UniProtKB/Swiss-Prot annotation:
One of its GO terms (molecular function) is metal ion binding. Keywords: Copper, Metal-binding, Periplasm, Plasmid, Signal. The chain holds residues 21 to 94 of 94 of the full protein. Induction: By Cu(2+). Maximally expressed 30 minutes after induction with 0.4 mM copper. Its main location: periplasm. This is Copper resistance protein K. The gene is copK. GO terms for cellular component: periplasmic space.
Length: 74
């Protein structure tokens, strides 16, 4: 995964994990730490209570986090 090239990792309520990379892509793993492709068009939940989806090679993070949630860092 490399924690150096990821801006934020998302832990799914299912155990699976998503990472938004500093290169702009995203990587998904299952509750067993194994890498698998993230299904486009599907909105999924996190343990933290956020909803996310991969659409058009992008990532919706409640959408509005992309809207006005640009902080540069966090």
């Amino acid at each position: 995964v490399d924690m150096s090239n990821v801006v934020k990792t998302y832990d799914l309520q299912d155990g699976s994990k998503v990472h938004v990379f500093k290169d702009g892509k995203m990587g998904m793993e299952n509750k067993f730490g194994k890498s698998m492709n993230m299904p486009e068009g599907k909105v999924m939940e996190t343990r933290d209570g956020t909803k996310i989806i991969m659409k058009g090679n992008e990532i919706f993070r409640l959408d509005e986090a992309l809207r006005k949630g640009h902080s540069e860092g966090g």
